[PDB]
Design a binder for this molecule. Structure first.
Ligand SMILES: *[C@@H]1O[C@H](CO)[C@@H](O[C@@H]2O[C@H](CO)[C@@H](O[C@@H]3O[C@H](CO)[C@@H](O)[C@H](O)[C@@H]3O)[C@H](O)[C@H]2NC(C)=O)[C@H](O)[C@H]1NC(C)=O
Ligand SMILES: *[C@@H]1O[C@H](CO)[C@@H](O)[C@H](O)[C@H]1NC(C)=O
Ligand SMILES: *[C@@H]1O[C@H](CO)[C@@H](O)[C@H](O)[C@H]1NC(C)=O
Ligand SMILES: *[C@@H]1O[C@H](CO)[C@@H](O)[C@H](O)[C@H]1NC(C)=O
Lengths: 107, 125, 167, 49, 49, 167
């Protein structure tokens, strides 16, 4: 129902760089968003809930912000474990669709 | 921290009952919803359906509403997925996860934190 | 199972929700849109009460000898004045905000009740306990359309009129 | 007795007796607040605003 | 401490106790040095009190 | 349109108004009584917040030397206390009032809507967009009587009943 888009589709960066990933939504979802990173063949884990807060047990290098139809996730220092893909999820209504996904890679 | 373990048949013929059972250790079916997430090979995630409490609140995907039925039993402490008329598009890695996160006493809808390691299943001849 | 009777404990998904009874199934449900508005609102209010406060580097403890008695009395007076004003303001503010929170929640319940009543003006008999008993028999798509806000009168008008004539 | 001297100032001591001479002097920077407190509690290495 | 055991070795009065306490309540950079030499500055005085 | 849909920009006469559609003519209108009562109130509310503030000739800046460090610390502490209490109370006051004024406007809109519904009763069908549509043919006199509150129900009850039988 609420269509989800992601940009950029693919991005590459080195260790220690700053990367902004902008998932965008068809209709206003207010401040409700979930960010998940998925290691290849592993269970995805929660990063950001409500687009502004940090779930406990996640390193504080990750930061998210935004409102309206546009949102951003900013990572300060990107280490080796953070090179996995990322996802964007809306939580306001059914169906609770997910983002297409953005892949990170070395250089 | 809850531990999630899921058991699957691992192989399924076309068009019969497909059932997987997910077990949780260190947690109970109290004040936390439980849902199923599947991903097709190389595609994004999607949400099949969610149970909450003990059979009180049942939420289903509109596309899969007739196909999936969620059943719970706290005494044996598992929640299971029942799927009929399985197709080739249903080949996926089934994930069972807990709706463990909450704000101001409400359980946020469909925001998942801890999942299982995954049970692969393929629909083929 | 009505709001005037009490509060449900089975559902935890949202603060506000509907209970549906059908031949096909029976369970609880929750209104994500209404609850999401309210959760956001309460979060903003609490943040404004705590955030608008900004402290600075101040030193409270002071020392004066026997000769400077007027200075000690002045310091005691200004400290007592600050703490009295802060206590009175904080206590009256928190009492008023608690009453607003309960009033806003009650108003949300009444708004939801009036919305579903305006949608089901005469198709469903009103028990008066917070329950709308449908005259016409309809399956789960009917009730979720009531949740969706897309319920229509003419589709079940004749069956409802016949059910009124039966009773 | 004590006094505070700005930079560029010279202090003069003149006496014929009954003077306790300053062996050491202290050069300090000005911190505006953070007055003295009186406690017997143990010290801990944690930062609290 | 509430009661200091070693407030002063020799009995006497301190001029402006609270003023010095407020001035020394916070110092970012504090160092100890000699304003005068211990033995070179006083040739004709004993300095062995 | 409708108030749940949005707000009209065509009407500049007053904050609240009516839109009448008729064969002889259609145009916007305003309910002066309700709008006028509201203006005097907020004029008092805005005036009360600004006027109650009273002042006396005051000198804030005070100068002290090195030998008066405790005093300058005391003056800085007390000035910081006044400015902190002033900014906190004021910021909360504007926020609470802003919520009330906006709610007062809507409460007024809801009170107005019901007055029209009660006067019309069942003669019209509520489209649910905030618009009442007349079953009976209604000329300019009965729209302005709806504005006046002098609409008479048994005059057009027969035509409305016959139009209910047709529909
Ligand atoms: C620093 O403080 C400590 C702790 O108070 C002092 O140590 C002890 O202080 C007491 C109190 O004056 C001394 O007791 C005295 O002993 C003499 C012995 O004849 C007696 O006549 C007095 O009536 C009193 O009871 C105690 O001796 C002393 N302990 C020592 C010196 O080992 C310490 O003296 C203080 N130091 C300075 C430089 O102020
Ligand atoms: C629910 O309402 C939306 C918007 O009014 C509509 O697009 C959708 O089709 C409705 N769903 C059903 C099942 O009628
Ligand atoms: C010490 O005494 C000698 C002899 O009187 C004199 O020359 C010298 O200036 C004195 N020094 C001081 C510091 O008074
Ligand atoms: C409008 O109402 C007033 C008071 O009820 C009445 O005197 C007046 O005649 C009414 N106007 C019309 C056109 O009926």
């Amino acid at each position: 129902d609420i269509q989800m888009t992601q940009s950029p589709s693919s991005l590459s960066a080195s260790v220690g760089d700053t990367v902004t990933i902008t998932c965008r939504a068809s209709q206003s979802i207010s401040s409700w968003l979930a960010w998940y990173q998925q290691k290849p063949g592993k269970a995805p884990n929660l990063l950001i809930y409500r687009a502004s807060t940090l779930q406990s047990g996640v390193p504080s290098r990750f930061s998210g912000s935004g409102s309206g139809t546009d949102f951003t996730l900013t990572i300060s220092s990107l280490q080796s474990e953070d090179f996995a893909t990322y996802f964007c999820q809306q939580s306001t209504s059914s169906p609770f669709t997910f983002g297409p996904g953005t892949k990170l890679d070395i250089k | 921290q809850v531990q999630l373990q899921e058991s699957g048949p691992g192989l399924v013929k076309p068009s019969e009952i497909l059932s997987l059972t997910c077990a949780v250790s260190g947690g109970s079916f109290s004040s936390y919803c439980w849902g199923w997430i599947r991903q097709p090979p190389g595609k994004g995630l999607e949400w099949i359906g969610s149970i909450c409490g003990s059979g009180g609140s049942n939420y289903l995907n509109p596309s899969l509403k007739s196909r999936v039925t969620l059943s719970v039993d706290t005494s044996k402490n598992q929640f299971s997925l029942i799927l009929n008329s399985v197709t080739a598009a249903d080949t996926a890695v089934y994930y069972c996860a807990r709706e463990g996160i909450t704000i101001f006493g409400v359980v946020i809808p469909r925001v998942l934190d801890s999942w299982g390691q995954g049970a692969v299943v393929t629909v083929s001849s | 199972a009505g709001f005037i009777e009490g509060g449900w404990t089975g559902m935890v998904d949202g603060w506000y929700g509907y209970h549906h009874q059908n031949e096909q199934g029976s369970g609880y449900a929750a209104d994500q849109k209404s609850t999401q508005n309210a959760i956001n609102c309460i979060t903003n209010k609490v943040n404004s009460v705590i955030e608008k406060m900004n402290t600075q580097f101040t030193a409270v403890g002071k020392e004066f000898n026997k000769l400077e008695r007027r200075m000690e009395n002045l310091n005691k007076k200004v400290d007592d004045g600050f703490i009295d004003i802060w206590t009175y303001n904080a206590e009256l503010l928190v009492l008023l905000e608690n009453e607003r929170t309960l009033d806003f929640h009650d108003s949300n319940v009444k708004n939801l009740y009036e919305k579903v009543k305006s949608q089901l003006k005469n198709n469903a008999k009103e028990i008066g306990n917070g329950c709308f008993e449908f005259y016409h028999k309809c399956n789960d798509e009917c009730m979720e359309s009531v949740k969706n806000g897309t319920y229509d009168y003419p589709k079940y008008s004749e069956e409802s009129k016949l059910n009124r004539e039966k009773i | 007795y004590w006094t505070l001297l700005e930079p560029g100032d010279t202090i003069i001591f003149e006496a014929n007796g009954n003077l306790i001479a300053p062996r050491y002097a202290f050069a300090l920077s000005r911190g505006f607040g953070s007055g003295i407190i009186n406690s017997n509690a143990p010290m801990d290495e944690c930062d609290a605003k | 401490k509430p009661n200091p055991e070693n407030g002063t070795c020799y009995p006497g009065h301190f001029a402006d106790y609270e003023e010095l306490r407020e001035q020394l309540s916070s110092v970012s950079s504090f160092e100890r040095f000699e304003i005068f030499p211990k033995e070179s500055s006083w040739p004709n005085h004993t300095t062995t009190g």
